[PDB]
């Protein structure tokens, strides 16, 4: 890999610089290089990895949605034929997006998840696995769409099971996992009742645990609780 000659610490330092410069593709390549050094990642390093790829794939997904909407309009009644270009360019973006998702899932499988023994790391990585299968599911249309959905579901479910046994209800990783699994139910699995029930129960259990927290931890947890509330307000 092109980062094989760079020190692990230098890769982490440059990932942080790339974040400050809003150069998220560089940031992701630096963190990919750091992961490929073969050592486990610290809490801060896991978050750098997540931030980098979230921004890269987030932009690809936003572009894909723009192009898919144009493509759908072109297929309505009365739309003038414009040739293959819209489909071609949506496919190009889609393929690039799938490639990034495959890269992230490859890092998780070789070998981040299998070495991750603490709840905070294992849940973090399993949530990522669910997220990137969910992004694949958003664009899937063929023989494997159901298997892609079930891969997302399975990763989220394992993360939920660990997080409920090993973390308090206000833990930000647990909360962000529940938020995204609830979005999976609503947006991917055609299960809006499950999405609402999960978001509400997660919110209420966290509310009841806030009294145990410092001011800084309270701020961290309530921020994500507000995201659960925003979704419930949108969905109900």
């Amino acid at each position: 890999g092109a980062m094989g000659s760079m020190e692990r610490a230098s890769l982490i330092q440059k990932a942080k610089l790339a974040e400050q410069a809003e150069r998220y593709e560089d940031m992701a390549a630096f963190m990919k290089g750091a992961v490929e050094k073969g050592e486990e990642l610290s809490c801060e390093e896991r978050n750098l990895l997540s931030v980098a790829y979230k921004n890269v794939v987030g932009g690809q997904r936003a572009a894909w949605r723009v192009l898919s909407s144009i493509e759908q309009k072109s297929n309505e009644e009365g739309s003038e034929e414009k040739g293959p270009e819209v489909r071609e360019y949506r496919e190009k973006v889609e393929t690039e997006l799938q490639g990034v998702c495959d890269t992230v899932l490859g890092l998780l499988d070789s070998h981040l998840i299998k070495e991750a023994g603490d709840a905070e790391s294992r849940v973090f990585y399993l949530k990522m696995k669910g997220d990137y299968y969910r992004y694949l599911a958003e664009v899937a249309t063929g023989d494997d769409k159901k298997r892609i959905i079930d891969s997302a579901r399975s990763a989220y479910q394992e993360a939920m099971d660990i997080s409920k046994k090993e973390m308090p209800p206000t833990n930000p990783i647990r909360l962000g996992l529940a938020l995204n699994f609830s979005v999976f139910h609503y947006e991917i699995a055609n299960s809006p009742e499950e999405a609402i029930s999960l978001a509400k129960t997660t919110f209420d259990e966290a509310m009841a645990d806030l009294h145990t927290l410092s001011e800084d931890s309270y701020k961290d947890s309530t921020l994500i609780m507000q995201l659960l509330r925003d979704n419930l307000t949108l969905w109900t």
């Binding site: 938020l179 979005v183 949108l234």
Partner: peptide, 9 residues
């Protein structure tokens, strides 16, 4: 590049 529009985190 991540938008702010999505329901996820």
């Amino acid at each position: 590049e991540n938008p702010t529009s999505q329901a996820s985190q």
